[PDB]
Amino acid sequence: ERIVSRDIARGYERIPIPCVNAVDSEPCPSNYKYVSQNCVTSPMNIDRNITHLQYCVCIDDCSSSNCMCGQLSMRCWYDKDGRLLPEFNMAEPPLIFECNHACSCWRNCRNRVVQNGLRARLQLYRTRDMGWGVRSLQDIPPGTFVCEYVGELISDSEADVREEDSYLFDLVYCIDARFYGNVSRFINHHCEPNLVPVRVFMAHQDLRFPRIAFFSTRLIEAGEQLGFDYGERFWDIKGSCRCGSPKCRHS
Amino acid sequence: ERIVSRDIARGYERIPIPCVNAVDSEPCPSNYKYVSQNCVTSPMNIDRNITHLQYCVCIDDCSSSNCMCGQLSMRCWYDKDGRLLPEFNMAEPPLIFECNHACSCWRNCRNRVVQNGLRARLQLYRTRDMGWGVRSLQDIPPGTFVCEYVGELISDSEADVREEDSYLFDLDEVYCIDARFYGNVSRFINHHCEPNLVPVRVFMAHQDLRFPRIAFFSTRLIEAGEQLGFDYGERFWDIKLFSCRCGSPKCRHS
Ligand SMILES: Nc1ncnc2c1ncn2[C@@H]1O[C@H](CSCC[C@H](N)C(=O)O)[C@@H](O)[C@H]1O
Ligand SMILES: Nc1ncnc2c1ncn2[C@@H]1O[C@H](CSCC[C@H](N)C(=O)O)[C@@H](O)[C@H]1O
Ligand SMILES: [Zn+2]
Ligand SMILES: [Zn+2]
Ligand SMILES: [Zn+2]
Ligand SMILES: [Zn+2]
Ligand SMILES: [Zn+2]
Ligand SMILES: [Zn+2]
Ligand SMILES: [Zn+2]
Ligand SMILES: [Zn+2]
């Protein structure tokens, strides 16, 4: 198992994200630019007017049903360790509105998780069957924020005239992780996924532009490959799945 | 000396900024919203196209003569400790272009200081004569990044129509940072005719030249307890009713 990179993120994450290869002689992928945060090429007129934010007036740690930001989210879904509550609907997730800089609360309040960024020790690695994949180097408990789907924010019109469509996440707007992305660009499709994407609003609340946060759907054991469900639009064009699920819907 | 706030920044800075009042019964200022980064109300079309960034191809920690981002800045002005080189012209500062996310270098490279944020221990306190000032609670060596002037980025024509002009920083199509309604610790810094702070125009995540960010660097050793001051400049005093109270033997606006 060769270490082909000590950190594909080049110090932009809280931890390094190594790339190893125990399978063949492919070096670390280098046909893209690692970015830890979403970027644009042509302008995207995101509403950043600070007076447009809805915000809370809490004097505590935003753990009460009075928090506006929790109400926008239906309730605050976060426990004190930043994990999704057991009652969180993994099959049909709500929008999460995290607290923001217009709010009266402190930066350490309960309702702040995704804005704190990636924490789990993850690793790019060569799979036997589906190119590069990502795995966790540690146990991740259920409902943990794992990573954000980061890339280039583009319009659907711009997406349609792109040659490569394998790194597209639909938000109509898209995140294309082909030329610019983070570690998420490498996560493989799985039919019984250990990650679910959740739409999240933080510094802005322009509803055209959710941020896409992956949360664990169960305990993810150390060494295990990360996967999420690419959804039906992807397979309608890309259809065989090699996830190896007894319940695989696309093989 | 009453402590009237643990931290006026509510945990948004690396360090807390307490407020104390040992002069009167004024409570902690609360007629403004503290923000640790610049904001807008009306849209500012900042060029944020990632392909418009100039960037470097450095294979080291950007400490060599060859750093392209250093070249944009004339040279990189930071030493190993993030302090401005002794050769830095405080009387006529260059534009600084810090490394960005488009550079080939690592996030811990030498050419990254302002983007790392406020680090010095500061305090909002009640002055006897000039209401609310900011002091340092530690010695700050010369050429250290102290704080950024943050507030609401607005056009010159929006600044013209506002009643409160006392928290305006002019940038250089002209734009201003208005810290009246939304600002950080810097909005509380008093004017001084021999200032221990100098504003430097800095570029980080974008290089849209209409929108520099304003970083205050120390002009000399500031000692523990010393009030911060910068020179508001002549435009300000040409308008401003009252005379300067900075108390400098060389005051120019007395
Ligand atoms: N479950 C699966 N079965 C077979 N191939 C898959 C797969 N999930 C992802 N892939 C492959 O990976 C692409 C998605 S991008 C994911 C990272 C990719 N393995 C890489 O090396 O860059 C798909 O278009 C497909 O080629
Ligand atoms: N050197 C100086 N002499 C007299 N007044 C000053 C001064 N420097 C700052 N001020 C006062 O502070 C204003 C700038 S904003 C600085 C913070 C201010 N002391 C506050 O309590 O909010 C000026 O318009 C003036 O009212
Ligand atoms: Zn709240
Ligand atoms: Zn909160
Ligand atoms: Zn809130
Ligand atoms: Zn499958
Ligand atoms: Zn460099
Ligand atoms: Zn650099
Ligand atoms: Zn650079
Ligand atoms: Zn003076």
Residue numbers in the entry:
A (entry chain A): 976 to 1146, 1153 to 1220, 1224 to 1235
B (entry chain B): 976 to 1147, 1152 to 1219, 1222 to 1235
Q: What does the study report here?
A:
Methylation of H3K9 in humans relies mostly on members of the Suv39 family, namely EHMT1/GLP, EHMT2/G9a, SUV39H1, SUV39H2, SETDB1 and SETDB2, as well as then non-Suv39 enzymes PRDM2 and ASH1L. Here we report the high-resolution crystal structures of the methyltransferase domains of GLP, G9a, SUV39H2 and PRDM2, and propose a structural mechanism for substrate recognition.
Mono-, di- or tri- methylation of H3K9 constitute distinct biochemical signals and are established by distinct histone methyltransferases; G9a and GLP are mono- and di-methylases, and SUV39H2 di- and tri-methylates a mono-methylated substrate. The Post-SET domains of G9a and GLP present an α-helix that contributes to peptide binding where other HKMTs have a loop. As previously observed with other HKMTs (for review), the co-factor contributes to the formation of a hydrophobic, mostly aromatic cluster (composed of Post-SET Y1211/Y1154/Y261, F1215/F1158, W1216/W1159/L298, F1223/F1166/T285 and SET H1170/H1113/H220 in GLP/G9a/SUV39H2) necessary for partial folding of the Post-SET domain. Post-SET is fully structured only when bound to the substrate peptide, or to a small molecule inhibitor, but the density is incomplete otherwise. (2) A loose conformation when SAM or SAH, but no peptide is bound, which may also accommodate non-specific sequences.
